[PDB]
Paper text:
Human RNA exoribonuclease 2 ([name]) is an evolutionarily conserved 3′-to-5′ DEDDh-family exonuclease located primarily in mitochondria. [name] degrades small RNA oligonucleotides of <5 nucleotides ([name]) in a way similar to Escherichia coli [name] (ORN), suggesting that it plays a role in RNA turnover in mitochondria. [name] forms a homodimer and interacts mainly with the last two 3′-end nucleobases of substrates by hydrophobic and π−π stacking interactions via Leu53, Trp96, and Tyr164, signifying its preference in binding and degrading short oligonucleotides without sequence specificity.
Similarly, in [name]–DNA1 and [name]–DNA2 complex structures, DNA substrates were bound only in the active site of protomer B but not observed in protomer A. In contrast, 7 nt (T4–T10) were observed in [name]–DNA2 complex, with additional interactions of the phosphate backbone (P5) with side chains of Lys189 and Lys190, and π–π stacking interactions between T4 nucleobase and Phe186. Due to crystal packing, we also noted the π–π stacking interactions between T5 nucleobase and Tyr122 of the neighboring [name] molecule. The electrostatic surface of [name] reveals a basic surface extending from the active site within which lie the two lysine residues (Lys189 and Lys190), suggesting that [name] also binds long oligonucleotides for degradation. However, based on comparison of the three complex structures, [name] appears to interact primarily with the last two 3′-end nucleotides, providing the structural basis for its preference for binding and degrading small oligonucleotides.
Author numbering:
A (entry chain B): 36 to 216
B (entry chain A): 38 to 49, 60 to 86, 114 to 188, 193 to 216
Amino acid sequence: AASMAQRMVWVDLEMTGLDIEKDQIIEMACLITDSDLNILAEGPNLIIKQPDELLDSMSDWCKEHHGKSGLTKAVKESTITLQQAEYEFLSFVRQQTPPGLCPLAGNSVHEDKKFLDKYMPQFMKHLHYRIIDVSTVKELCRRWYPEEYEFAPKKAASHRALDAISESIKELQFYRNNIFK
Amino acid sequence: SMAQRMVWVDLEIIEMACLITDSDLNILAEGPNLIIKQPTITLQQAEYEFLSFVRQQTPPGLCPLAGNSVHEDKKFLDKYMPQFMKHLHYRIIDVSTVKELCRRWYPEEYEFAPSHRALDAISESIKELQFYRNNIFK
DNA sequence: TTTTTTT
Ligand SMILES: [Mg+2]
Ligand SMILES: [Mg+2]
């Protein structure tokens, strides 16, 4: 009840860039945890089709990283539309969380929220407006617990959405274990 | 030390306020407290006042926006004050993130945690984060 | 325990 309302909706996106006016979502993953960061449910992990012209125009960082990770190719091969992706993610969180009560969670997840607010508004209607930004806790750890910050996880296994989620949960667990009372 | 400062902002016609704290949440400098029309001084002049202020107070690109759910403020400022946001880091210090963790992990303490003026909103946010540091951090 | 990057 209150336990269900204290779940967290962990999301990570890959995009063609950081320009909300032109860039698009190309990968999205979602995990549900309970309030103590135990993974309760693994949602869709989807590569979303976007136009060839947009991928050929990406920044140098995106061209390099999304090419080497295999993401650009998978996007070109994907048959999943933005609208179908949104359908699957909304179906998932409907099954897992009470409407309006649970926050998005992840590293600097406000950026993902900007993109989801634009491109998956029906998904975002299911969520709270507050976020659990693990990078806020990162910045506080850096300032207030610099010794501990030396040992915190920082880098995911890949610049792919599901690996980023996995690392973000592990980083928050590290902060809970090392800098909270 | 200067790289660990924080740029506190709040937006509430829109009223915008800003101030600077050090890493330990001590207020170092009060910035502009201004009123603009939603898109009394123009948006561009307001943006210059805030950008000039943070240029005098923080190193470029290094310091985060801070406040309660300050990602909402950041969405607005990213669109309408992009030259101000260029001076700042892309990470934020979202006090409401610490609130949500307090509510889950420290419910007893949460029960004691901390006007509609923007400067008052900043003051409350700093006090709330200080309460969390004092009561739920190691 | 880590490996200065929101994409
Ligand atoms: Mg990430
Ligand atoms: Mg990534």
